[PDB]
Structure formats: structure tokens, C-alpha cells
Design a protein around this nucleic acid. Structure first.
Ligand SMILES: *[C@@H]1O[C@H](CO)[C@@H](O[C@@H]2O[C@H](CO)[C@@H](O[C@@H]3O[C@H](CO[C@H]4O[C@H](CO)[C@@H](O)[C@H](O)[C@@H]4O)[C@@H](O)[C@H](O[C@H]4O[C@H](CO)[C@@H](O)[C@H](O)[C@@H]4O)[C@@H]3O)[C@H](O)[C@H]2NC(C)=O)[C@H](O)[C@H]1NC(C)=O
Ligand SMILES: *[C@@H]1O[C@H](CO)[C@@H](O[C@@H]2O[C@H](CO)[C@@H](O[C@@H]3O[C@H](CO[C@H]4O[C@H](CO)[C@@H](O)[C@H](O)[C@@H]4O)[C@@H](O)[C@H](O[C@H]4O[C@H](CO)[C@@H](O)[C@H](O)[C@@H]4O)[C@@H]3O)[C@H](O)[C@H]2NC(C)=O)[C@H](O)[C@H]1NC(C)=O
Ligand SMILES: *[C@@H]1O[C@H](CO)[C@@H](O[C@@H]2O[C@H](CO)[C@@H](O[C@@H]3O[C@H](CO)[C@@H](O)[C@H](O)[C@@H]3O)[C@H](O)[C@H]2NC(C)=O)[C@H](O)[C@H]1NC(C)=O
Ligand SMILES: *[C@@H]1O[C@H](CO)[C@@H](O[C@@H]2O[C@H](CO)[C@@H](O[C@@H]3O[C@H](CO)[C@@H](O)[C@H](O)[C@@H]3O)[C@H](O)[C@H]2NC(C)=O)[C@H](O)[C@H]1NC(C)=O
Ligand SMILES: *[C@@H]1O[C@H](CO)[C@@H](O[C@@H]2O[C@H](CO)[C@@H](O)[C@H](O)[C@H]2NC(C)=O)[C@H](O)[C@H]1NC(C)=O
Ligand SMILES: *[C@@H]1O[C@H](CO)[C@@H](O[C@@H]2O[C@H](CO)[C@@H](O)[C@H](O)[C@H]2NC(C)=O)[C@H](O)[C@H]1NC(C)=O
Ligand SMILES: *[C@@H]1O[C@H](CO)[C@@H](O[C@@H]2O[C@H](CO)[C@@H](O)[C@H](O)[C@H]2NC(C)=O)[C@H](O)[C@H]1NC(C)=O
Ligand SMILES: *[C@@H]1O[C@H](CO)[C@@H](O[C@@H]2O[C@H](CO)[C@@H](O)[C@H](O)[C@H]2NC(C)=O)[C@H](O)[C@H]1NC(C)=O
Lengths: 420, 420
DNA sequence: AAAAA
DNA sequence: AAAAA
């Protein structure tokens, strides 16, 4: 494949929730809200948004919180740019219940096309892919739902990638697949049409001029059915990256459960666990795990995390460390539903970086839809170094604790920490 | 296949080392030495012995211990029955070094055919199958090497199965394969001749009148190359038995390491571990692990055992308990090489029983040769109940300790227990 | 934000 | 008894 001769730059945007403060003053990136506002201001031809749910108002949460202001602003911008001529298209998973949808109808009346994709009746899951494609030259990919709490109340990790028409259209292709697949009546085709096929997969990634220095990047999609022949499955890419590492593997994910949740009877899913154990045993790879715990985390997950932190010895030089990153909450933020959590889902090695939109559980890789970006840069510094610095800042943060920490000591309510 | 109309009875023989005493007086079986002596006395037509090594003298150990007397007696019997007309045939793995072999030459001069099978040059391993076939009607299968220490100094678990011409010849077939395969020059055939093929495998086991009540039994062999089309691999049978269980799984094995030992670079082998985790998570199966620790155990093994004992929670009702069975030793028994250990390798469920000759490591299932017996009896009581009683006696014995036990507290030297 | 028999 | 670079 011909290299993409475009000034593809890339910014690691993150939304630090109020209260959280890293006392380093050395790493600084635009927040998710700032990047989204800039993309909307620069949007003049197209805007494709794949989202899980839309809660850009204090109305939909039934809360009176000023912190939603930024989110409301985004909604206002989304209302203003539709009449200007931008072909706004939004794919949002069909809600389980018939709850009112103020934002979606507000954009529909303005002129924004909305299609209700229903993953439950197609592959038995939800559509949890959160990404943007702006003018088909820039794009966004991260853990930020189209919510005000996502912008302010929870922590995110995403990439805004500018001037990359080639990686922007390869990402759209997924949005086009969602658009065609979830309009009405139509089901998953046996064979995907060539329009959705891609050429930049794991064996032949795409060459970009990522800040001048050449780099190899490509996107991975899920669930396996909604995947064309060219596209590399998200699980396969994740396993390849965790296997190719030879020095260290740093993982910061919201939820890591090696089981097929959201289904019964309970099923065991040892896919990422086996890869982590292989990498940490056969090779001297040091594995560092950073999970996030809140009030809506499965208490069984600890029982698996303890199964990994206990595998470390001298003879094979095994080294696995597991830490929980819990976002502190107060009385004011307690009343907000799904208020405080670290939703970042990514990992970084000494030779590659993976940034995804789905938690590390069997559903997100076999049923729930998701998208991830893989970047490998030959050289010292760059995107990989920036993400490694982000992960170490997270790792040494006061909010990151060991698996033996007392739950009451942590500010927020954690179900994975035994009391006293 | 037609059922084997033979009074196939079955005795669980075990060799309790001196010093060990279970204060129950309710379970009693003939020792391995007694059963071997009875088989030799009743031997008049044939005697096939597959063994790892031959140390039936105080000479070969270079020790002066009266406890070898029984072993010497066995050797004497093995010398006496050869001139009587018994076709004694012994398959013993070729030693790494050119050490003297008094017992093998003593039997060779009497008239016992000995063939030096060399597993290292054939499949890259050793021949660790310990079994007897006496007159092709009885047989023995257990963890007892042809050693005096095996008979007295270490603990064993084996089956002597009388009046079973059908299960005796199915076991011989393996000895015939070893005999032909390890004579001289000849290598492993691509396709095994029909003479070594068997009909009683996992899908179609053999029906026997095991103490009157019908039962389904069959044998499994390793390594996968020295296996005909009919024969079921040992690993496949082990996985099937650990998967079919629905209530509990009790495992008492000498060494359980989910790695490919005896080879470099270090390799990860998550085959039995994954099955145990699946059984204990998907179903409410209670898994109890009884490992044995001595002075020649890999210290890394604890790092994996802690990975299993830490997987137990309420939401999925997971329950895995790991215990170490350490045979106490004194100053007198310390000087004996490979003196005190619990060498039993078996497991029992609520519906099946597995008795093997090899430890639970990757080599023993992929390179090292081994044989195991599988029995499933429909009813309450019988062989399965006897083995379950044996396992619970072992589990509650004072010699069985938890993984957090202090090493100095245990009588013997254990490398898997952290000091103080 | 995929917690919700 | 498969501990032995
Ligand atoms: C590849 O090329 C792209 C294109 O330039 C680079 O993207 C730039 O990345 C740098 C650093 O990652 C960004 O610089 C940082 O911007 C942050 C956001 O600035 C906006 O928001 C603040 C909010 O108050 C406004 O005041 C400001 O005017 C902007 O609107 C700043 O917060 C950062 O400052 C932090 O670091 C400095 C030290 O440098 C400290 O003194 C500060 O206190 C603070 O801690 C910083 O300035 C830049 O904005 C990005 N550009 C764009 C267009 O997004 C990629 O980084 C590059 N890739 C690599 C690997 O280098
Ligand atoms: C299917 O059928 C076969 C054929 O009979 C059964 O095999 C018999 O199994 C029973 C019990 O498992 C055996 O009985 C036990 O024998 C032990 C060994 O006895 C020999 O060694 C002692 C050593 O001193 C000699 O004294 C003795 O004369 C024998 O030469 C005994 O040690 C056992 O005694 C224990 O239990 C009793 C209570 O019953 C206590 O009072 C004792 O103190 C001691 O704790 C016991 O007698 C029998 O020997 C086996 N027969 C053969 C030929 O091997 C299978 O058991 C059967 N299967 C099932 C499931 O029932
Ligand atoms: C993506 O590509 C566009 C197109 O090149 C970038 O916009 C360009 O940004 C540069 C500097 O950021 C601008 O250069 C400046 O121009 C002004 C006059 O407009 C001049 O006074 C300055 O000294 C400087 O030279 C350039 O004009 C501008 N071009 C356009 C068409 O907007 C954009 O910055 C790229 N994205 C990122 C994240 O860098
Ligand atoms: C395997 O099969 C052989 C053959 O049947 C069994 O040997 C038989 O054992 C029974 C009792 O154990 C003997 O019965 C006894 O016979 C004597 C006379 O010899 C009699 O006085 C007793 O009252 C009793 O009836 C039988 O004779 C004997 N037969 C032979 C040919 O040895 C053997 O016991 C079986 N194996 C096991 C473990 O049971
Ligand atoms: C919710 O949306 C409505 C209309 O878009 C706005 O407030 C509602 O309408 C009037 C005020 O305009 C009030 O009498 C209603 O009680 C309001 N509804 C609610 C649920 O408060 C406003 O845009 C939104 N309300 C907010 C953000 O509080
Ligand atoms: C063997 O492992 C031990 C601990 O598992 C190592 O000892 C130290 O352990 C602490 C806490 O785990 C570490 O912070 C140190 O870095 C370890 N090393 C030293 C020198 O203090 C020990 O180093 C390992 N290796 C050997 C040869 O004993
Ligand atoms: C070892 O075998 C030899 C011959 O089979 C026996 O003892 C050896 O020979 C004479 C006594 O017959 C002694 O002078 C030697 O010193 C003995 N050898 C050793 C190593 O002691 C006897 O059968 C065996 N020796 C034992 C069991 O101590
Ligand atoms: C939940 O788990 C706890 C412990 O993991 C159970 O509490 C007791 O724990 C001890 C020691 O582990 C056991 O010996 C008891 O059998 C457990 N039960 C009781 C009633 O004491 C607890 O039972 C589990 N279930 C619930 C509903 O809490």
C-alpha cells in the first residue's frame, strides 16, 4: 500500500475530572471538551459520530449540576452546525427501554440524521464504539461517551488525530458499516460488500508521517461478525501487541474480567489472561495492570486480579503488579449517576501502543462492538513515549492503590477492596 | 465392543513409608511390595515390566539401609522365576550416563530379556511408565518405580487389577510398542501397525464386571507420537475427566507445573490450569489440590499454585483449595538420595477416577512417556469411593499443610514454603 | 457508563 | 525420582 503523504499529527486528549490533580505540571494536553469544540468549529463538510448514548443535558440525568455546562455547549454547537450544511450523522445504540431522548430529537429537528442501530437483535450486545470523523480529515477515538459526565465527571483517554484523510476514511468505513447495518429491518450480510473492506490491517499496517517521523498505524474493529475480510479483529490485534512486547507491558483499563459477562450461564474467557501470563513467564516482560474500581464494578473481578498479582517469582523473573485507580468522590458528586470513574482503556509497551474504546471482557470482543487504534513508531520519543509518560503518571498517582488496600481508606466506594 | 466377561477385581495398593501413620484403622490395602510378591509367586507364563530405572539393591544407592530388604527380596524373586520358564521382559529407559547396572545384568544372565529404550533420541524425553503385566491376566499400574525406596521410602498409589485378561492385554500393547520401538536403531514409525492399535478409548470405553457391578474403564498413553490411532492421549483423557465433573475434583499429584520444564527457553503450558479454572468457575465444582513438596521440587511451582488458591469468590461460588503433602524425614533418612516424597499421581471426581504414572507437567504429556487408567462406575461405592476415601484421608492428614505454612514447621525440607 | 435477574 | 546448566 502507498504511504499516506499527509501531515498526520496526533494529540492525546484526556478529561481530568474536577478534584483530580496530578502535581507534575510537566505533561499537558487539551481536554476532550476543548478538542471536540475545536473540531466542531472547524467542521464545515461532514461530521460522523458513533456513540453509545446521548446525555448532553442536565435534563437527561435529572440532575442540577453546573458541570454539565460544557456538555450543553457541545450540544448547542451540534445544533448550530447542522443548518450550516454539515452532513451530521449519528449512530446510537437502541436503548433497552422507551426512555425519552431530548438531545437526539433536538438534533433530528435541526437536520442531523439519526439511525437507531440495535445490537441486541443482531449479534446480542450493545454498540459501545465512541468515535468522531470530522470532515473526513480529522478523527477522534477514545473512551468518551457523548455525555457531559464523560466530558467532566469521569476520566478519559483518547486521540484526536488531525490532517489524516487516510486514517479518517478508514475509520469512517466502520461508521458506514454501522449506518447501513442499523437503519431498519436489514441484518448482518453474510459477506460484507467491498465498500466496507480495508487494506490496512495487522500484517500490512499503514505508513504515516506521524509528526514527521514515519510510523505504522492501523485500526481494529469488533464484534467479529461486523468485520470485513481486510479488517483485523480487536482481540487479535490486542493479543499480537501483548505478545510482541519484550521488556514491559503497561495496561490501564476500566474493567478487566476474563469471563463472558452479560450472559448466562457464566462462561470462562482466558484469552488476554493467557497472553499476559505467557509474556510475563516465557520472556522477562514486566506486566503492570491499572484497573479502575467504582460502585458499579463486579466484585468477582478481584478474584481474578489476585490470580495475576500472585504470579511473580525469581527463577523465571516473573513480575506482574496489579493496581486499582479509584477516582475520589464527595457528597456533591455522589448523587450523580455514573459520576466518578477512570474510563481509560489502553496499553503501552516498549515498541507499540494500543488505544481502545471497550473494556477488557469477553463481551466487548465477541458481541459488543468496539474500535481500537494501534501505533508503532521506530525511534525514541513520540506518541508511544507520551502514552508511557501518561501511564507512569497514573501509576504513581495518589489515587492508584494496591489490591490489599482497605476500601474505607479510598475516597470513593470500591467493591474490589476488602474492608479493614 | 463386546463386554469383557471376566471377574475383573481391583485393589488400590499403596506403600506407606516408615514413620507415616494414619490414625484411622478403617482403610487397609495390601502394600505395593506384598502385591508384587504375590504377582511374582503366581507368575508362571509371562511377566512384562515397564520401568524408569532399576535400583533394587543397597549397592546401587551406595547406602547401607536395612529397609532395602524387601526390594532385594523382589530382585531375588525376579532372579528365581526366570529359569522356571517365565518370559521376563523389561523395558528400561537408557540412562544419561554410563553408570553400572547391577540388577539389569543380574536378570540378563538369568535369562530375562532387557531392551534399552532411549527416549531422548526418539521424542526428546524419558520413559517414566511404571507398570506390570503378569501372565497377561493381572496387571499393575502406579507410581512405583522398580526401586527399594519406591517400595518403602516413598509413598505410592497404584492399582493391582486381577483376573482381567482384556485390560491386561490392552495394557501390554503399550509394552509391546515400547519393546519394538526401543530395541536398536529403529525409530518411531509414521503409522503404527495394527498390532498396537486398540479399540477401548474415551468415546468407547471397555465394559468390565468390576467387583460384579458393571463399570467403564480404559487406558490412556503418552507421548502423543507413541500413540496408535485407537489409543486416547493421556492429556485428552485427563481434560475430559476434569471437564465432566460437576460437584468436586480432588487431585493428588507429586508435581503440578503448567510449564514445559526440562527444556529451554521456558515455555508456558496452560492446559490443565485452564480446565481447572473453567470447571471451578462455570460450574460450582469444588477443586481440591494436594501437591507434594520435597528437596527436589522447583521453587517456581509455588508461584503458580498461589495463582490457583487465590481464585475463590461467592458470586460464582468458586472454591479452589491447594495443600502440600510433605513426607517427614529424619537424620537417618536424610542421607538416602530421593528418600522421602509422596509420589502419588491421581485424581477423583464424583463420577470418575483417574490414576496416572506421570506428574502434571508439560513434558510428561508431550515428550515423556506415561500411562493412566480411567474408571467410571455407575452406582454408590466401589473403586471411586475407595479412592475418594484415600484422598480425604490424605487431605486431613497431619502431613498436609496450607500454602502459607512455615517451612521450618514441616518435618522435611520444602522449597515451596516461605521461611517464617 | 454496558449493572441490573 | 526425571533436578541438575
Ligand atoms: C505532534 O504535533 C501535534 C501538533 O502540534 C502536537 O500537538 C500538540 O501537543 C502539545 C503537547 O502535547 C500541546 O501543547 C500543550 O497544550 C495544552 C493545551 O493547550 C490548550 O489549552 C490551554 C488550557 O488553558 C490553553 O491555555 C492553550 O492556549 C491551548 O488552547 C497545554 O495545557 C500544555 O501546557 C502544559 O505544558 C506546559 C509546558 O509545555 C506547561 O507550562 C503548562 O503549565 C501545561 O502544563 C501544552 O502547551 C499542543 O496544544 C498540541 N497542539 C494541538 C494543535 O493540539 C503533538 O503533541 C505532537 N506529537 C508529539 C509526540 O510531540
Ligand atoms: C473387589 O474385590 C477385590 C478382591 O477381594 C477386593 O480386594 C480386597 O480388598 C480388601 C479391602 O480393600 C482387602 O482387605 C484388606 O487387606 C489388607 C491387606 O491384607 C493383607 O496384608 C495384611 C498385612 O498384615 C495381612 O495380615 C493379611 O493377611 C493380608 O495378607 C488388610 O490390611 C486390611 O485390613 C484393614 O482393614 C480391617 C477392617 O476390614 C482392619 O481391621 C485392619 O486392622 C486393617 O486396617 C483388609 O483386610 C483384601 O485383601 C483385598 N483382596 C485381595 C486379594 O487383594 C477389592 O477391595 C474389591 N473392591 C471393592 C471396591 O470392594
Ligand atoms: C492541519 O492542517 C492545517 C492546514 O495546514 C493546519 O492549519 C494551518 O496551521 C498553521 C499553523 O498552525 C497556519 O500557519 C500560520 O498561518 C498564519 C496565517 O494564517 C500565519 O500568520 C502564521 O505565522 C502561521 O504561518 C496555517 O495558516 C494553517 N492553514 C490553514 C489552511 O488553516 C492545522 O494547524 C493542522 N492541524 C494541526 C493540529 O496542526
Ligand atoms: C482370580 O481368579 C482366580 C481363579 O478363580 C482366583 O483363585 C481362586 O480363589 C478362590 C478364593 O479366593 C479359591 O476358592 C477357594 O478354593 C479352595 C480350594 O482351593 C477352597 O477350599 C475354598 O473354600 C475356596 O472355595 C479358588 O480355588 C481359586 N482358584 C484358583 C484356580 O486359584 C483368585 O482369587 C482371583 N483373584 C482375586 C484377587 O480374587
Ligand atoms: C430541560 O429542557 C427544557 C426545555 O428544553 C428547559 O427547561 C424546562 O422547561 C421550562 C423552562 O424552559 C421549565 O418549566 C421546565 O420545568 C423545565 N424542565 C425541567 C425538567 O426542568 C431546559 O432546557 C432544561 N431544563 C434544565 C436544564 O433544567
Ligand atoms: C529474589 O526475590 C526477592 C524478593 O522476591 C528479591 O529481594 C528483594 O525484594 C524486594 C521486595 O520484593 C525488592 O524491592 C528488591 O528489589 C529485591 N532485591 C533486592 C536486592 O533487594 C531478590 O532480589 C530476588 N533475587 C535474588 C537473587 O534473591
Ligand atoms: C553388592 O554386591 C556384591 C556382589 O553381588 C555383594 O557385596 C560385595 O562383594 C563382597 C561381598 O560379597 C564385598 O567384599 C564387596 O565390598 C561388596 N560390595 C559392596 C559395594 O559393598 C553384595 O551382594 C552387595 N553389597 C551390599 C548389599 O552391601
Ligand atoms: C461469602 O464468603 C464468605 C467468606 O468468603 C462466607 O463467610 C464464611 O467464610 C468462612 C471462611 O471463609 C467459611 O468457613 C464459612 O463457611 C462462610 N460462611 C458462613 C455462613 O460462615 C459467606 O458464607 C459467603 N456467602 C455470603 C452470602 O456471605
Amino acid at each position: 500500500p502507498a504511504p499516506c503523504y499527509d501531515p498526520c499529527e496526533a494529540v492525546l486528549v484526556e478529561s481530568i475530572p474536577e478534584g483530580l490533580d496530578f502535581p507534575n505540571a510537566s505533561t499537558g494536553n487539551p481536554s476532550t471538551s476543548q478538542a471536540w469544540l475545536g473540531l466542531l468549529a472547524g467542521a464545515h463538510s461532514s461530521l460522523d459520530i458513533a456513540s453509545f448514548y446521548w446525555t448532553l443535558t442536565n435534563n437527561d440525568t435529572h440532575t442540577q449540576e453546573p458541570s454539565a455546562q460544557q456538555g450543553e455547549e457541545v450540544l448547542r454547537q451540534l445544533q448550530t452546525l447542522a443548518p450550516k450544511g454539515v452532513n451530521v450523522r449519528i449512530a446510537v445504540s437502541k436503548p433497552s427501554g422507551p426512555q425519552p431522548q431530548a438531545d437526539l430529537q433536538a438534533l433530528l429537528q435541526s437536520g442531523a440524521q439519526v439511525r437507531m442501530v440495535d445490537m441486541q437483535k443482531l449479534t446480542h450486545g450493545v454498540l459501545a464504539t465512541k468515535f468522531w470523523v470530522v470532515d473526513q480529515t480529522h478523527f477522534y477515538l477514545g473512551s468518551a461517551n457523548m455525555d457531559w459526565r464523560s466530558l467532566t465527571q469521569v476520566k478519559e483517554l483518547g486521540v484526536v488525530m488531525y490532517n489524516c484523510s487516510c486514517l479518517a476514511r478508514d475509520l469512517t468505513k466502520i461508521f458506514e458499516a454501522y449506518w447501513f447495518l442499523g437503519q431498519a429491518g436489514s441484518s448482518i450480510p453474510s459477506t460484507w460488500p467491498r465498500f466496507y473492506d480495508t487494506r490496512y490491517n495487522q500484517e500490512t499496517p499503514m505508513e504515516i508521517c506521524l509528526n514527521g517521523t514515519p510510523a505504522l498505524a492501523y485500526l481494529a474493529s469488533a464484534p467479529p461478525p461486523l468485520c470485513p475480510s481486510g479488517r483485523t479483529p480487536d482481540l487479535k490485534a490486542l493479543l499480537n501487541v501483548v505478545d510482541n512486547a519484550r521488556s514491559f507491558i503497561y495496561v490501564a483499563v476500566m474493567n478487566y474480567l476474563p469471563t463472558l459477562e452479560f450472559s448466562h450461564p457464566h462462561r470462562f474467557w482466558p484469552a488476554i489472561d493467557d497472553g499476559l501470563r505467557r509474556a510475563t513467564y516465557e520472556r522477562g516482560v514486566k506486566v503492570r495492570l491499572l484497573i479502575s474500581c467504582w460502585g458499579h464494578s463486579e466484585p468477582s473481578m478481584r478474584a481474578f486480579l489476585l490470580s495475576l498479582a500472585a504470579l511473580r517469582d525469581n527463577h523465571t523473573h516473573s513480575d506482574i503488579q496489579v493496581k486499582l485507580f479509584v477516582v475520589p468522590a464527595d457528597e456533591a458528586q455522589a448523587r450523580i449517576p455514573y459520576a466518578r470513574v477512570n474510563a481509560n482503556k489502553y496499553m503501552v509497551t516498549e515498541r507499540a501502543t494500543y488505544i481502545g474504546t471497550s473494556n477488557w471482557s469477553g463481551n466487548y470482543f465477541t458481541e459488543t462492538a468496539g474500535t481500537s487504534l494501534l501505533v508503532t513508531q521506530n525511534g525514541r520519543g513520540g506518541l508511544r513515549s507520551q502514552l508511557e509518560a501518561i501511564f507512569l503518571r497514573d501509576w504513581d498517582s495518589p489515587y492508584s492503590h494496591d489490591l490489599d488496600t482497605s476500601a474505607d481508606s479510598v475516597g470513593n466506594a470500591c467493591r474490589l477492596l476488602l474492608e479493614v
